Design a protein around this ligand. Sequence first.
Ligand SMILES: CC(=O)N[C@@H]1[C@@H](O[C@@H]2O[C@H](CO)[C@H](O)[C@H](O)[C@H]2O)[C@H](O)[C@@H](CO)O[C@H]1O
Length: 620
Amino acid sequence: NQQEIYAAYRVANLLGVYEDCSPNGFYQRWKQKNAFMKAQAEEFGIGSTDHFIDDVERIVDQRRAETEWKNADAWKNGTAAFGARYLTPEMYLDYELKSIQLAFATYKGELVGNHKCHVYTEDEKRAFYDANQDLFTRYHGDLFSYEEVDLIIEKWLKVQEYQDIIESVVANTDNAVRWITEFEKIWNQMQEEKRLREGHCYYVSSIHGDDANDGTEDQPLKSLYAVNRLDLQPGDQVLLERGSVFENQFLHLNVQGTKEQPIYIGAYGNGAKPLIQTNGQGIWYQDYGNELDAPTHVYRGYVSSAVLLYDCEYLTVENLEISNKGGVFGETYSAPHKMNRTGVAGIAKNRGTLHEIHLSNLYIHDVEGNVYDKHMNNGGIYFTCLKPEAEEKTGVARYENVSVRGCHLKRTSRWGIAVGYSYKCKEFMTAELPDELFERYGHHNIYIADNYVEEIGGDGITVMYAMKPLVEYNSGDSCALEMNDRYYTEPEDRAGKVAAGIWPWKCKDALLTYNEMRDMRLNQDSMAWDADSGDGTLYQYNYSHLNEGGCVMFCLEEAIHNEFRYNVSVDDLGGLISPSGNPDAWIHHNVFYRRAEVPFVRPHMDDGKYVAEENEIHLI
Ligand SMILES: CC(=O)N[C@@H]1[C@@H](O[C@@H]2O[C@H](CO)[C@H](O)[C@H](O)[C@H]2O)[C@H](O)[C@@H](CO)O[C@H]1O
């Protein structure tokens, strides 16, 4: 709320987080950040997909072939461009609120204004450990030792002290009314600037429409059910009116454009993005048609999805707000078989390769999916491939030329953004992954960029079964919030109580670059980066800060040909690198800032093979 924002900037001013903690100060930092990214970031992947999506694999090869640290001096002096290249007002406000909280969590000063900063004693931190054992078990139920979580407990206690100061300032509320009044005007201006930056045409208006209308702008349709019944054709557009709220509704589409005449779903008019408020409706039946990589993963069942793109092609969906809240009768939040829920679900099944599906500038929040299930279409955005009715007739279900750009996810469970999990998973159960597997079964030209993921129950961003995916210029914070026994109460036989930030699964020669991940929430994993099972993963030019499981993992015997170079890690906790049973990892020409009592190699995930050389390791 407005009083909490006011309070946060009062604390920012006392900590010296920003020079100008007025509403205008906020506006100017927002404009400066967006201008900086526009001036300094790479240009590839900005603007219309038709100008770049066929070149993803080429630009990946060019970047993988780099022989020196691009703009090393900016990286090393703290002026490099990374994370999302455009921050919406909502992304940017949340980014700064997280910055202020983390600055409190690391402040060493005696006072914040008249607040005496508490010094957490060993007895107090041990008391918290003994009272919160459900936060400190690992994948197999074994406890982190107190010594392994001491500094994390201190961070958590300082974050709670920060949150208590905010509630104190809210309770004690003159120049607050002034600050809030000006902020409201600044916010409205920022919304106008964001909005400016944005076949048959069908118009839908929840307020003004009628489903008996022809769907022109003057006589728009009323509901998404009417859209679900349209025989959309190549070149058609469906435009949902800004200010619309589609209560309990959903968009479930099975439509194909062409390359020359794609279909477009987007917004028209003035005001807030149209809101698809699915509230647990929008039921469909998911069935992969065979067991997945582990026999315990759930692979069939009903799913609720706000947007379902079922065998769609040559379709862009843009400028929608989506939620998918549960809370139906009989349901509890951590129930073992709570329904899987998606914001946007993509499915390939009966059309072989699906081409040219693009998501853009979606705001997806409060998707309350099953806490546990990893590969149902469960989370903010989840694209999967199911066994075809008749693969010999219609071909392998898979993706080509697919992008997810400029999306803001907040409070989605389980996944944030996941693209590519396939019924063909058992074809990839070797360490080395020949290109032929991707030619037959895998995805091509997959591009995930300029997204913002925050407050995610599980993993932030994952790409699966793709050749040379490019995952870049994404910002994340505070993922893996539910990967602990307090929320992960009834896993049954599914295990899976782990998450990392932004990572590839069973990809070939993936490139993850120019990403930013902060404040991952403790679990056995909880690092920013994860060269997981797959072949050739490269991370370069990524920024990580205050992740509770450290900087980067190399996970087990099928995580092969891993390289980690030209990254910056600032005050990651637990331990910087997690080479856990991996066969190789080349970790070179990075910069790490670690506390003396945070080890370079993380405890219990230290028995893999790696070459660490030419790294700059600073003590802080
Ligand atoms: C090899 C391994 O244990 N990797 C872990 C990941 O778990 C795998 O994730 C894939 C995702 O497609 C499948 O679910 C597979 O069955 C799992 O073994 C885990 O998701 C990540 C992040 O926490 O790290 C490893 O723990």
